[PDB]
Design a protein around this ligand. Structure first.
Ligand code: ADP
Ligand code: ADP
Ligand code: TPP
Ligand code: MG
Lengths: 509, 511
């Protein structure tokens, strides 16, 4: 086999059904072999940066591997943003870059650039494979590292000559198993006793609970403790659950900060949050002040970064939370008022009117802009897994990319992307990618003709008109009367992308 | 005297009048200070990747410093492509990134990322400045390094708290002097002796001649030798000059290939070319085989990479070529047929028809796509400085960026950007940037609904209609009759960008 096809066969054997990126000469050994592979679809994007946002979302929502591929040089460096994002999110994305021939590196070959040291700071593993005899050990090694321990992105560079050489030994390795960080059962036995013993506490749930939501809720029930989520984890716990108070942190709820900053709960049970800027209201001491601190995390670096932890529970949440529930069982709230929408033409009232016209199962993918604060603070979490938020790396356009990744990984779930004017100018040509793959996504663009959150203000663009010129259904909302259930429904009914442009210069905070 | 403000004072003192990038929280000390500065215009782009392409072009055509600025995290990483390009092009672009506060790195602050080691492989110098007391030494050093004998991009990351801190000593260094590598006068005199003695030869001119075209042409005249240019240097020597044969290399001319590969010229005088893939027809030996090889370059790494050089002349071309002309003066051809346009609706014929409607002074900024080969092989070089080509790093959308950079640095020169649908979907939103800054640029979009050069083929997009929805004048061409002088002329007469979309599924093979 050609080296390029063995690399795809390893990805296929590991369950990959999509590859995101842009074809070119230095990566068309890959694309010309995907001509004859019914099991893998290349998803051609308009910018490789967006391909990385899609891959991360795809990895997140398939709970497995994702893949990007880009040409040597400019394609590879356009992927660095997507890898930095995936690295911060602990998502297992393989970044495949072309390379110029082994013989001609150093000679200013066309699109020459050694990608290995550029990807090294934003990946768990990075390698340029300069010998066809090492291709299977390197793609195999990259795949196990991406999926093992604390998952993360990896980068493999394949010179174009190597891509076409035959691999000496084509034997395929088995599919990688995720090697989870296993929790110390002795530690869990003691923590359970210490949670009983100290009687009162609260749970701060970050996004690390995302694969153990039923267990996380059962632990709160067994302890009868209230739960607050980080802004990033807003969509993991339904507002209907009697123990779920709301969001603590950036754009968070008054009921949740009154809990955290009061004198009522002895234990701070921190489950799956790195306790960064947006989870802690810029490192406010209230979360753990005058409390006993228990933190559950699989990344050992996170403990005692800023908040001293009395019990650090190293281990994967999908092992330790269900284990903790069994240990607590063997040994033995206020809430946030939902927000009410109104008639005045405000970002708050537009988004709330929007929510009441959409299925309860809708996943909101939220881009980076002022509208993010209203989504986090005002909209209701109707069911679990419904808010794709990034308040970490926060790349503009990652909301657009995550809508496309989510619709590819979980087609049965409806998707609305809440984005903005500036995010549309950066990555809104991907809507053409959504069109080519026939993906039903409603893109709600909040056009305020400024990069908010006179160089900042622009002459307004008719984004609804741009969408129509792209052959994409759209409506422009310029008043509240324009936002009708009939229009929202008629847009979601299309088999492909649609744009609801909300032209709204709201000067509120 | 805040640190972000002293950084702009150093940039202002070094002649910088524009800064390209996208504002955000982590760099808004800079933009909030650019409100108080009449001398510096921020150029807000739609993607920071394109901001780096504009900066590189802006650096090139003002022949001096340029500056990009991006937010910590995703802004900074989006500039990496733009820096890799400036690095390969030896262009003096300063890359400024915000950073999270010094106190909070390691704690997962919002948009936290240490950019220093990411920029290190694609810059001459990279540094995260963690002490306000070290800020003036760091921007000062970055500028001196950017403007080196071998110019290049530099990266300075400034934590957002440092940006707002007062600097301890506000003494400003003088403006950096751009360095020019000095050639050894003994080497130049010996080379001159060997050009006289060996009688015949030819010049291979790369883009390192861009700042010494009149000296370069005089040296050819004094020696009476033919000149071939690299594809990248196509636009530096006019077709009218009797010694200029044409382009050798990617998409090059057969008259130039016949010269290089014939048995006629004793000396291969290579002036300002790294002898990379597109300059040598993928490392073909004809350039120097059985010839006496002399190479002029300011980068000492380029000599003997692949072609053995008998005399390497380290030095800046604007010093050594004029010196060589004086040394040769003291001690003492079949050109490529111009291309003829036709009626057939072909890329070759559309582009030659285009050129017959544009001022001779037009600069073409050429994006990355199949149309590139037709531009290099077929269009006429009417006067010098008119072909912004990239056949090196070759970032899609760098053609779009280079037009905006060119129009800002050299407003009096008309600009036409030859681009494609794939480059339009990548960075076409930058036409909105041209609109905001009232830059008259004609964007010719070669739309074949595929990514040239089932996955490659797309449903066609009406890019002319997209342009009209953006408030941009446009015409769609679907037949040769649609490409009229009146229409090109009406588009070029607009005070802002305009789009001429050439919807053309041409299946001929590119040069
Ligand atoms: N399955 C898991 N088990 C344990 N920890 C996890 C798991 N998945 C993610 N995490 C951890 O959860 C944290 C998520 O924090 P972060 O990404 O900052 O989100 P948030 O904004 O919700 O705090 C990280 O520290 C990561 O190590
Ligand atoms: N003023 C100058 N003096 C000397 N060398 C220069 C000058 N400007 C650019 N160069 C050099 O010329 C070379 C340009 O080669 P390259 O960028 O590959 O263009 P081309 O494709 O025309 O060969 C580089 O080696 C660079 O060092
Ligand atoms: C950032 C980046 N990604 C990928 C490439 C590879 N590449 C070179 S040409 C090309 C196709 C060109 O597209 P378009 O503008 O449509 O040209 P056309 O199809 O009209 O020839 C691609 C994808 C690149 N140059 N830069
Ligand atoms: Mg095309």
């Amino acid at each position: 086999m050609k080296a390029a096809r063995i690399v795809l066969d390893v990805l296929k054997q590991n369950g990959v059904q999509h590859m995101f990126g842009i074809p070119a000469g230095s990566v068309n050994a890959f694309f010309d072999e995907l001509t004859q592979m019914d099991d893998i679809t290349p998803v051609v994007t308009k910018h490789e940066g967006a391909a990385g946002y899609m891959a991360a979302a795809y990895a997140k929502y398939t709970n497995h591997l994702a893949v990007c591929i880009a040409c040597s040089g400019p394609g590879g460096t356009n992927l660095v943003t997507g890898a930095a994002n995936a690295m911060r999110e602990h998502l297992p994305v393989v970044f495949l870059t072309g390379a110029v021939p082994v013989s001609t590196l150093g000679l200013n070959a066309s699109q020459e650039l050694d990608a290995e040291p550029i990807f090294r700071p934003v990946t768990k593993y990075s390698a340029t494979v300069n010998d066809v005899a090492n291709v299977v050990e390197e793609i195999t090694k990259a795949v196990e590292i991406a999926l093992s321990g604390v998952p993360g992105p990896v980068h493999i560079a394949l010179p174009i000559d190597v891509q076409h050489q035959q691999v000496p030994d084509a034997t395929l390795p088995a599919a990688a198993e995720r090697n989870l960080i296993t929790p110390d059962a002795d530690v869990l036995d003691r923590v359970a006793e210490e949670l009983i013993a100290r009687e009162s506490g609260y749970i701060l749930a970050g996004q690390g609970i995302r694969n153990a939501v039923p267990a996380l809720l059962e632990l709160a029930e067994v302890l009868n403790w209230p739960v607050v989520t980080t802004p990033q984890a807003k969509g993991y716990l339904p507002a209907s659950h009697p123990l779920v108070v709301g969001v603590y942190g950036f754009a968070g709820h008054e009921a949740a900060s009154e809990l955290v900053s009061g004198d009522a709960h002895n234990v701070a049970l921190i489950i799956g949050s790195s306790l960064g800027e947006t989870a802690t209201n810029n490192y406010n001491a209230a979360i753990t002040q005058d409390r006993f601190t228990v933190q559950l995390d699989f990344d050992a670096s996170v403990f005692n970064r800023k908040y001293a932890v009395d019990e650090a529970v190293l281990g994967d949440i999908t092992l330790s939370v269900p284990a903790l529930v069994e240990a607590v069982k063997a040994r033995k709230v206020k809430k946030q008022a939902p927000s009410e929408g109104g008639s005045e033409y405000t970002t708050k009232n537009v988004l709330l009117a929007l929510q009441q016209s959409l299925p309860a199962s809708t996943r909101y993918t939220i881009d980076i802009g002022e509208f993010m604060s209203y989504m986090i603070n005002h909209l209701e979490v109707k069911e679990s897994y419904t808010y794709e938020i990034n308040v970490h790396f926060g790349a503009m356009g990652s909301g657009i990319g995550s809508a496309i990744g989510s619709k590819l990984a979980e087609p049965e779930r409806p998707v609305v992307c809440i984005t903005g004017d500036g995010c549309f100018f950066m990555h809104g040509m991907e809507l053409l990618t959504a069109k080519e793959y026939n993906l039903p996504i409603l893109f709600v663009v909040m056009n305020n003709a400024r990069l908010g959150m006179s160089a900042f203000e622009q002459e307004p663009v008719n984004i609804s008109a741009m969408a129509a010129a792209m052959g994409i259904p759209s409506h422009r909302v310029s008043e509240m009367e324009d936002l009708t259930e009939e229009r929202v429904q008629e847009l979601l009914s299309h088999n492909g992308p649609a744009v609801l442009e909300v032209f709204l210069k709201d000067n509120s905070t």
